Symmetry: D2
Subunit: 298 residues, 4 copies
């Protein structure tokens, strides 16, 4: 059968680039894009929203697929290089292909949020607002079937606190120089908050993206951080999780893995306090309310 | 009735700009472009030619017109912002509109050749080869019903010779400084050519884009040029035509007007010898064989 | 004297555009840009940081100013179209101009933060990271001599809470439809927070960008909001400030004016809880620690 | 010593690309470009000519070279990525480097005229007018020390005539289908011209870019062409030169090689008649007056 290839991915994920390259290497494939169409019927009005226009672009897409997909044995298929993140539209393509006898394949472009943001900020006039991008990424996560937290019944309620930038600031050292992280001063209001919650009966769970330690001393930083939280901040934590030694992945990935493995099953986490934008974005995205206490664009 | 507006014009004539502006001012109008389509189905392969692809783009255009033109009383019409310089395709749009009951209007963008070339050279990746541009302009002229020469029966055969850059060069003066045009030296081979033709029985007609003269002396330059051709070159001309005093139009326009009014009806012109690119382009375009004797890109 | 015009403004404020336009209208003025230089010596390496390179660009700038500023009576001056937000560099230009006898003028481009961000997100490859942009804006504010809060001694400590998106969410209405703002449901954790602080002895000050009311009923929304906070949330507030009726300025401006006039002189504000990104950015920028409780990119 | 690398090449020859790549691979090298400077002092006025501005850019270049070239052992050299096609300016760089003790190297980018034109037509806003490009190429040829014809004393005078498009047109075949080149019809006026010159005593030399023949019959086309010229056109030629079988180079190169080897030493060639633009450009460039008899943009 002729293929109908739907690209699935948030804007800037590489869908168009792939489409061009693929067509350049496999004769018999054509591209259909709601976007070449959207810009076209408007004579290229800057992207800076009608149900009718969208109805036109939709008609263009299917009518164009039918015509192309009926060429001779020369035509192999069509690529629908849109985000295709709306489930109903994806279904519409499959039921369309079933009645005309064509097969539907998916070409996924799962790019990390941090890469999506980075690329999007350079997209120029094709850049998309952060809120629609975050919305696209949420749909992408639902497509991949990634987990969303909804509480842990029968478990004590808890608040998650990060260390760097949240409970602590930094008294003249420098990001990634943990050897002197014992000099960090307290962020008064946040430190105070953690004590307030404890009094309210919440379990205080501390998390940190600081590497636990070095190759020869795997918990060097985990220990200093623990002493700092105990002796300097005075935070009555029930648990302290931290990036494992050697682990070079993004705080992003590291903290979520830590969450599902070590926190979610033991606590009914009601809140997370953090400062790094990519982490704060991770928390809210997986279902955990998150309060950002300072600028964290790094 | 709903309108189907066909833009008629060579590339770079302003068709897209107008289309955007018009849609921005008149809600209910949509744009259809073989080109948004051509680039789209190929995932934007650089423009640097199949009868099948063109068949697809064509289908897209009509199918898209039908759908749009059938919206409610909200839709006023569609703009077909292509060159639409191929007569058969223009007819195809009119017979298409007649059977579905829509009206066809034309929005012409007649830009002068010299402006087309100028703009095209800056078009970047959308620039078109000079030969296809010259071809587009020829079709545009046929659309406008502009005249093409095919000889003048019963009249003596003649060769047209230009002066500046052709019969004469320039001995240290400067373009537009006719006050010293009497110092020009002969272009030997070309001067010799004119005498050769005379011997062959051709009438030698001299033409010049040099203003005839000044406001107080309207033939100052016409006279010097005539003396130069007689005494210095020794060209046995039967007629000498020249740009009228005060006339500020392009050599382009000036020489063709001169041709139809004063030459075409009295001579069977078989050839024209010239050096300025825009003039040489004019000659060939209206049906007169033209030999360019030197670089004339000014 | 010849002028040395320093443009003062964060990237994207219009410095280059103005410079081009000004030179186009006033012959005798030349442009010097650390940036044409930075890109140039590197053969245009993508902007994606050496003290030596910067030393070169600096030398280029002054050496180029000296040469230009010494032309004849034809030269009027030079424009230094950089951000010029670093005070020491600004001083360096003035002491440079004093010893050579030239005058220094400033051309300020004070664009609102929200406009800077908006423009920056479309800047493409010239876009600047949000953290350096926020840093530029902080220096711009210091240039303008705008106020920075540092506490109010002798006054009771307080926490500022916003309503929309912070204490309340929204149960099926829509932004700007205050007529049904009485249906908003509580944001449990945040509502709880306000009570926690009260117990700790902090004064709870509520702020809202919701227009107080309509032309015929100037406190319609102020009253509903007040009842909602009292009866539904149960927030023990000491004061409630809100956007005045008719006022169409940005929440940005509105809340800061409200802060200086009605809050700062009566309270020692230690914290602000809010959700809208532009407001959260305003709080931190003027010296008030701010916790963002949810995505607020609208 | 520190190096001063001058790039030598017409615009579009790859000078900037090379410069970026080289700097990216060899730390210690900086780029100086009259052009980053020209655009910069004018706040980027579209390129669409003062002796003073040029004086400023010049000062910027040398002053910037001195400063850079005096860094520590870290600096290796500077690249002057301009065309550097003006001999006096090249000399100025060498005498500048001699007095300060630096060495001057050249990095040449000799791109074929046809490639220069091709690239230039796509250059967009950086495209250069054809006449300045042709001027740049002439200087490049003088730099390379390429030959320029100035006549052959003691030898009979001759006119060179091309076949395809000049003496012959084409009666329904197609470029590169020589198997049916025997069907070409005469271009009357041009054929007549060749006879006129013969009567005047000129030697008629015929040249053709048509491959002489095939691998199994190396003169198949040379013979048909010769018969066509003899029996159909009636051209009294003294010599017939033609592209050798197997030779795949551009007509460009092929005809000039043919000229120097077989024509220049036996004839005092006074004129060449041709129709292909790249060939016509070759003729004039090497010193031979050339008349283009029809559009030859292919
Ligand atoms: N692997 C990559 N690394 C760096 N940049 C990339 C990569 N892939 C794509 N980009 C850039 O991101 C932007 C997204 O382009 P595009 O292919 O059209 O994505 P999409 O069609 O999914 O919106 C482009 O400017 C592109 O050059
Ligand atoms: N009146 C004008 N003066 C100068 N430039 C123009 C003018 N009109 C159009 N152009 C330029 O010429 C190019 C042709 O653009 P476009 O509008 O798309 O023409 P077309 O659709 O006919 O090919 C554009 O880069 C445009 O900016
Ligand atoms: N008043 C304005 N309205 C909308 N966009 C603007 C305005 N002024 C400038 N811009 C855009 O913002 C970007 C900033 O350009 P630029 O003039 O170089 O600023 P700067 O030199 O201060 O960094 C440009 O892309 C420009 O077109
Ligand atoms: N080898 C090549 N093949 C195709 N295009 C090229 C090549 N080299 C350069 N170009 C293109 O030609 C233009 C000339 O660019 P540039 O490097 O700045 O040349 P120059 O500095 O000599 O004027 C560019 O748009 C470039 O991408």
């Amino acid at each position: 059968m002729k293929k109908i290839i739907l690209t699935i991915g948030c804007p800037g994920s590489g869908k168009s680039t792939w489409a061009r390259e693929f067509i350049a290497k496999n004769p018999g494939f054509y591209n259909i894009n709601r976007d070449d169409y959207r810009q076209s019927i408007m004579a290229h009005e800057e992207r800076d929203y009608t149900k009718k226009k969208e109805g036109i672009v939709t008609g263009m897409q299917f009518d164009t697929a039918k015509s192309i997909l009926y060429g001779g044995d020369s035509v192999k298929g069509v690529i629908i290089s849109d985000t295709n993140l709306n489930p109903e539209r994806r279904l519409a393509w499959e039921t369309f292909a079933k009645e005309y006898g064509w097969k539907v394949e998916h070409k996924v472009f799962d790019v990390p949020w941090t890469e999506l943001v980075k690329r999007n900020s350079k997209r120029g006039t094709k850049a998309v607002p952060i809120d629609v991008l975050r919305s696209m990424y949420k749909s992408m996560r639902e497509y991949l079937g990634l987990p969303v937290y909804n509480g842990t019944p029968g478990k004590p309620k808890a608040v998650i606190f990060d260390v760097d930038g949240t409970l602590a600031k930094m008294n003249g050292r420098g990001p990634y120089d943990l050897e002197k992280c014992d000099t960090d001063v307290i962020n008064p209001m946040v430190v105070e908050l953690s004590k307030m919650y404890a009094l309210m009966g919440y379990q205080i769970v501390v998390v940190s993206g600081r590497e636990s330690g070095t190759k020869e001393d795997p918990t060097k930083y985990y220990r200093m951080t623990r002493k700092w939280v105990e002796d300097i901040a005075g935070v009555p934590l029930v648990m302290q999780c931290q990036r494992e030694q050697g682990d070079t992945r993004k705080d992003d990935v590291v903290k979520e893995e830590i969450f599902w493995k070590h926190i979610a099953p033991h606590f009914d986490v009601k809140l997370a306090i953090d400062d790094r934008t990519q982490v704060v974005e991770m928390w809210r995205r997986i279902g955990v309310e998150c309060w950002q206490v300072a600028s964290g664009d790094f």
